[PDB]
Design a protein around this ligand. Structure first.
Ligand code: 5GP
Ligand code: 5GP
Length: 204
C-alpha cells in the first residue's frame, strides 16, 4: 500500500545559509526572522533511498494555499539568488517531494508549518540557554539534547562552515511518520559525517 516509510522534516538556520562562500538573497518580503525555517518535508525509505518527482504532471496551485502564503513567506522563505517570493522554491518542493507524500497540496504545506511550530527549535534551545552568538561556543551535545527534550525524539544535525572557518549548525533533521501525524524516532539518519564537538549558532 503506502509508497514510503517515513518523512525527514528538514529545517534550516537562515543565518548559516547566509554567511558562507555562496550567494544568499533575502526574500521579496525582506530579511527573514532569526528563527529556524522550513527547508523540506521529504518522503523517504528506510533503506536510505527515496521517491521523488512522483507526478510530473502536477504543478503547484497557489489558490489552494492562498491563505497560507503570507505565513509561508516567513516560515518557508527561499534564500537563493535572485531574491524571490518563495513560490519557485515551494513549487519545486511540491513537485519533487510533495507529489510523493500521499498528501494533497494544502495538507502537505500545512503539515510542514505545523511540524515547524511543534518542533519549536529556537525556543527549545533558549530553554537550554543556547542562543545565537558568534564563534563555536556550543557543544553539539547540548544542542541535540535541548531539541530532544522538547521534541521527544533526537534530531540529526547537519553543519556547514562560515566564511571564517567556523563550523556552524546549518540544518536540523527530525522524522515524521508516513501519515504525517507525529514525530517519530528516525529509522535511519543521513551519513554526511559532520559537526565537530563545538559549533557556532550564528546571528544574522
Ligand atoms: N527524501 C530525500 N531527499 C533527499 C535526501 N538527500 C538528498 N535529497 C534531495 O536531493 C537534494 C540535494 O541537492 P544537492 O545538494 O545534491 O544539490 C535535496 O534538497 C533533496 O531534495 C534524503 O536523504 N531524502
Ligand atoms: N537549502 C536551501 N535551498 C534553497 C533555498 N531557496 C531555494 N533553494 C533551492 O532548493 C533546492 C532544494 O530543494 P529540494 O532538492 O529539496 O527539492 C536547492 O538546490 C536550491 O537551489 C533556501 O533558502 N535554502
Amino acid at each position: 500500500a503506502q509508497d514510503f516509510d517515513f518523512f525527514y522534516f528538514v529545517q534550516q538556520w537562515p543565518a548559516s545559509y547566509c554567511d558562507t562562500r555562496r550567494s544568499c538573497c533575502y526574500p521579496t518580503t525582506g530579511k527573514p526572522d532569526e528563527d529556524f525555517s522550513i527547508h523540506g518535508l521529504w518522503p523517504n525509505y528506510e533503506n536510505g533511498k527515496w521517491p521523488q518527482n512522483c507526478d510530473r504532471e502536477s504543478s503547484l496551485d497557489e489558490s489552494e494555499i492562498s491563505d497560507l502564503i503570507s505565513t509561508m513567506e516567513k516560515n518557508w522563505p527561499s534564500l537563493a539568488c535572485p531574491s524571490s517570493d518563495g513560490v519557485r522554491f515551494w513549487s519545486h518542493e511540491w513537485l519533487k517531494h510533495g507529489t510523493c507524500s500521499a498528501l494533497g497540496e494544502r495538507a502537505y504545506f500545512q503539515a510542514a508549518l505545523d511540524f515547524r511550530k511543534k518542533s519549536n527549535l529556537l525556543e527549545n534551545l533558549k530553554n537550554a540557554e543556547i542562543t545565537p552568538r558568534n564563534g563555536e561556543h556550543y557543544t553539539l551535545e547540548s544542542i541535540k539534547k535541548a531539541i530532544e527534550e522538547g521534541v521527544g525524539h533526537s534530531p540529526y544535525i547537519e553543519c556547514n562552515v562560515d566564511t571564517q572557518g567556523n563550523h556552524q549548525i546549518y540544518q536540523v533533521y527530525l522524522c515524521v511518520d508516513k501519515t504525517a501525524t507525529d514525530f517519530i524516532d528516525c529509522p535511519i539518519f543521513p551519513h554526511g559525517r559532520g559537526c565537530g564537538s563545538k559549533i557556532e549558532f550564528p546571528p544574522f
